């Protein structure tokens, strides 16, 4: 059979020339039964057609088609918990959008589709239905009607098989939760497979770390209340007895590094089997096989068990893979952030041997920038090479600007408002620019800041900061003055270590003192500067312009940021003034915090904080009183009122600036003051030492299901402040404020957890060793950031 010409029935949207461009059969061809079947299913594979019939006229071979209906609109009904536009976006992604055609054989898959989304967020009674209304000119108008129903919540997380540990105390470390107190953010009661998955891993590790080497998970069951509003999960476990590690035999393609791998699998026998201590050396081996070129070194450990001794012999098998080479590291998706910004985070080098782990390191290095919604990594074999390979990163960029209101409430600050606007990836340069504001009882602080996190390629940062602080000493429990400062800082930050940071920078400050109630300490400083103001009239002013070289060192080896349980944080930070400044001083402060645990589950840890500060003038001038050190309060010596510890003002007789009875003043000639006057209100010193010792304990009364969520301390706090230029000789009647031997001490209990209002710290302290002047404050607290 030869075709003289080809004719078309039922072509509407599809151009004759498009259908004609799709067919194997051509004009003037000798076609048989199998050739026409091969174009019938070519036309079908176009996806423009509902039914294709290709049959023979005499001369002509004619094509009958029914074109799939063209969507006229997509509308959404009863879709409460998901917004029309976002859900219209997912439909376009999957191939259903206005102007494109609908195959009527997927309208069910469409519902089953986004209805299956609802099951993911636990609306198990959800029901989405497509009604596809026909219109003239072969169009449809599909509306998806939704019945979201009610979200289902976990009624119970039961464990069965557990004898050595109570069900409740195991659930303690679970992400999925069956009970969430009103006053505690332990998580939602909402189900996800991902949560259960990592939770069965938390359960498996928990056991293996305690030497349960033959611990298996026999089965997991997620049941479902008929009404579909309640979810019951049950793990069934066999927790075979404890086992000490006998030895470890390494057996596979070691690439003749058998020498160094016995150093990685050295163990002191008798030591209990430990699942993470096992994974450590599976990764130590896999790391130095990586160190010798190999992409995907596989290590797999199989505990060989002997019940006579009750020992386990670790049979580790390892076969180093092949070597491969990265020819290109591509980045697709970065449509706003420049290539260097995400390239400089890579630990895999281009034009070098790949490490399966170095490309993984380089992925979450991009996630922790927080510049990308998603970060997916693909490793392709470069065509026609046995070992060369491309590594591409597929990023989805997110809006990285933000406004952030903060409200907090503490006994040191009252309400504190944080508020600022922030852009972390300025025009996709990795540049952080932001305007930030702080405001409590005693100070308001506004700053503008630009940072380059990679001044140099190795990630030393160069800071940049205009600030404005406005301080009211009265509202901070101090001898009343007011500082209205402003200036500029530029600081390099050098990383030297995963655990150590350095920073060095210069900075101008313009202090502007006024409203100073005359005292001898504040005055002897002003006489250092050469300024000689009225000793009787608290309408005064002093304006310094300082230039300061600032340095600092921070060490952080805290095993975890929240509820630290092991290792130390240490922060040293110093100031000294380059000559040409009005003032001539230096200052150094050192903070220490050391956690050592005393049990294996890390539920009893002792903590040693120490806070040291020292400063003094250089050219016979003094250190300003506005740079003084303070002590006492919830942050330092708990039980004492904020800044109460140290030297107290001794006032002059002066005239109060706006006098008003029914208002107490301190040495106003208006109340018959003749000579100098002792006081309660503190001024602080240029030399401070505080040191506490908390004893972190399990919290004793609430459920072990969420007990780990709250941390009880018992603390013994000590501290002193003093000033060294205090003329003890000249002020013989008054106490010796140059004597540091005056150590204040307090004991009490502290609670700490995360509530709906934010993170709490309740300190209830009791000052048993308190000196005259020192003001007590036994109950202190903090809600949010303060």
């Amino acid at each position: 059979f030869v075709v003289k010409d080809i004719h078309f029935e039922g072509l509407q949207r599809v151009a004759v020339g498009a259908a004609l461009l799709s067919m194997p059969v051509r004009t003037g061809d000798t076609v048989n039964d199998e050739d026409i079947s091969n174009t019938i299913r070519a036309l079908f594979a176009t996806g423009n057609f509902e039914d294709v019939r290709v049959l023979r006229d005499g001369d002509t071979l004619l094509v009958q088609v029914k074109e799939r209906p063209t969507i006229a609109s997509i509308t959404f009904s009863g879709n409460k918990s998901v917004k029309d536009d976002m859900l219209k976006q997912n439909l376009e992604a999957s191939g259903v959008r206005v102007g494109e055609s609908l195959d009527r054989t997927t309208i069910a898959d469409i519902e089953k589709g986004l209805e299956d989304f609802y099951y993911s967020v636990g609306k198990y009674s959800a029901s989405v239905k497509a009604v596809v209304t026909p219109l003239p000119r072969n169009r449809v108008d599909l509306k998806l009607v939704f019945q979201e129903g009610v979200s289902a919540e976990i009624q119970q997380i039961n464990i069965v098989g557990n004898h050595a540990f109570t069900t409740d105390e195991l659930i303690s470390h679970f992400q999925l939760r069956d009970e969430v107190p009103w006053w505690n953010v332990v998580g939602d009661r909402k189900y996800q497979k991902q949560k259960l998955a990592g939770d069965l891993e938390t359960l498996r590790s928990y056991y293996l770390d305690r030497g349960y080497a033959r611990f298996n998970i026999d089965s997991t069951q997620v049941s479902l209340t008929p009404d579909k509003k309640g979810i019951y999960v049950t793990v069934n476990i066999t927790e075979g007895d404890q086992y000490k590690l006998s030895g470890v035999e390494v057996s596979g393609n070691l690439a003749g590094h058998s020498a160094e791998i016995e150093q990685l699998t050295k163990i002191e026998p008798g030591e209990l089997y430990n699942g993470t201590k096992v994974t450590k050396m599976e990764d130590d081996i896999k790391k130095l096989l990586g160190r010798y070129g190999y992409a995907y070194p596989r290590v797999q450990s199989m505990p060989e068990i002997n019940d006579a001794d009750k020992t386990v012999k670790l049979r580790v098998n390892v076969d180093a893979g092949n070597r491969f080479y990265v020819r290109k590291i591509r980045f697709e998706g970065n449509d706003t952030s420049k290539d260097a910004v995400l390239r400089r985070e890579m630990r895999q080098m281009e034009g070098a041997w790949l490490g399966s782990d170095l490309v993984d390191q380089g992925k979450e290095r991009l996630n922790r920038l927080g510049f990308f919604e998603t970060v997916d990594t693909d490793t392709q074999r470069v065509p026609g090479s046995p070992d060369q390979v491309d590594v591409v990163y597929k990023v989805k960029e997110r809006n990285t600007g933000s406004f952030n209101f903060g409200i907090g409430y503490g006994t040191e600050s009252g309400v504190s408002f944080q508020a600022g606007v922030q852009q972390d990836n300025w025009l996709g340069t990795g540049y952080a620019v932001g305007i930030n504001g702080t405001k409590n009882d005693y100070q308001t602080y506004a700053e503008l800041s630009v940072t380059n996190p990679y001044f140099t390629v190795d990630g030393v940062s160069l800071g940049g900061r205009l600030f404005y602080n406005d301080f009211q000493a009265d509202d901070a429990d101090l001898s009343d003055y007011t500082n209205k400062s402003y200036g500029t800082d530029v600081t390099l930050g050098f990383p030297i270590n995963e655990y150590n940071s350095l920073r060095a920078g210069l900075g101008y400050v313009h202090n502007s003192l006024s409203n100073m109630q005359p005292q001898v300490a504040m005055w002897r400083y002003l006489y250092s500067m050469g300024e000689h103001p009225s000793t009787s009239d608290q309408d005064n002013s002093f304006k310094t312009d300082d230039f300061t070289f600032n340095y600092g060192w921070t060490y952080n080896k805290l095993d975890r940021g929240y509820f630290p349980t092991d290792g130390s944080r240490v922060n040293l930070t110093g100031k000294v003034t380059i000559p040409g400044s009005d003032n001539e001083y230096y200052k150094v402060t050192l903070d220490t915090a050391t956690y050592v645990p005393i049990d294996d589950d890390h539920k009893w840890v002792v903590l040693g904080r120490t806070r040291w500060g020292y400063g003094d003038g250089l050219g016979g001038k003094e250190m300003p009183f506005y740079e003084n050190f303070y002590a006492g309060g919830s942050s330092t010596v708990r039980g004492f009122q904020s800044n109460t510890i140290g030297p107290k003002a001794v006032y002059f007789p002066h005239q109060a600036s706006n006098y008003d009875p029914d208002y107490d003043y301190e040495c106003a000639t208006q109340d018959g003051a003749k000579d100098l006057c002792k006081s309660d209100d503190a001024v602080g010193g240029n030399a401070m030492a505080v040191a506490s010792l908390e004893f972190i304990t399990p919290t004793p009364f609430i459920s072990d299901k969420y007990a780990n969520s709250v941390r009880t301390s018992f603390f013994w706090d000590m501290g002193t402040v003093w000033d060294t230029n205090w003329d003890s000789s000249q002020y013989s009647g008054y106490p010796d404020y140059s004597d540091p031997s005056n150590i204040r001490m307090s004991a009490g209990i502290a609670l700490q957890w995360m509530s709906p209002l934010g993170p709490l710290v309740f300190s209830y302290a009791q000052p048993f060793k308190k000196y005259d002047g020192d003001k007590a404050e036994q109950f202190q607290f903090n809600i949010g950031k303060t």
Binding site: H7, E9, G10, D51, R53, D57, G58, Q64
Partner: protein, 154 residues
């Protein structure tokens, strides 16, 4: 986002002109790939901002043998002839049923006339009645269907 509404309008570009590198003697330049290789398509066409980018009942056909060859395909296609006036060169057909492949079926009676029109001969098919699913009612669709069936016979 806002950066796109300033490309999409008019902005122009005169980037560094291309120039072939000369190879020193005693060596050659790497082999040219050919992927990013601009052909020299000549002509004076307007370049950017001067370039107009705005986008640019009855069916009759023309073709002794003529008339008897028309009544012949209608007889071989199994359409009943109602009124056959060979003299006036105009016939009437009974209700012809079509298929195509869409919705519910359309059915019509026609008037096929063949009379000379200058140096050629015309075949004029007029759709008399059009009853779809027993409901007289698209108009060009089924006049051209009948005109196509006689045209394929020719």
């Amino acid at each position: 986002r806002y950066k796109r509404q300033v490309s999409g309008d008019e902005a122009y570009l005169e980037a560094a002109p291309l120039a072939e590198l000369h190879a020193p003697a005693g060596m050659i330049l790497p082999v040219t790939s050919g992927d990013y290789a601009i052909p020299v398509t000549n002509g004076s066409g307007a370049v950017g901002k001067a370039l107009d980018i705005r986008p640019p009942d009855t069916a009759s056909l023309l073709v002794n043998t003529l008339w008897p060859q028309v009544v012949s395909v209608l007889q071989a296609k199994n359409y009943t002839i109602t009124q056959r006036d060979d003299a006036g060169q105009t016939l009437t057909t009974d209700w012809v049923q079509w298929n195509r492949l869409d919705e519910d079926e359309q059915r019509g009676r026609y008037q096929i006339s063949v009379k000379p029109q200058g140096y050629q001969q015309a075949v004029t098919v007029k759709l008399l009645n059009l009853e779809q699913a027993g409901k007289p009612v698209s108009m060009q669709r089924y006049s051209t269907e009948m005109m196509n069936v006689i045209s394929a016979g020719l």
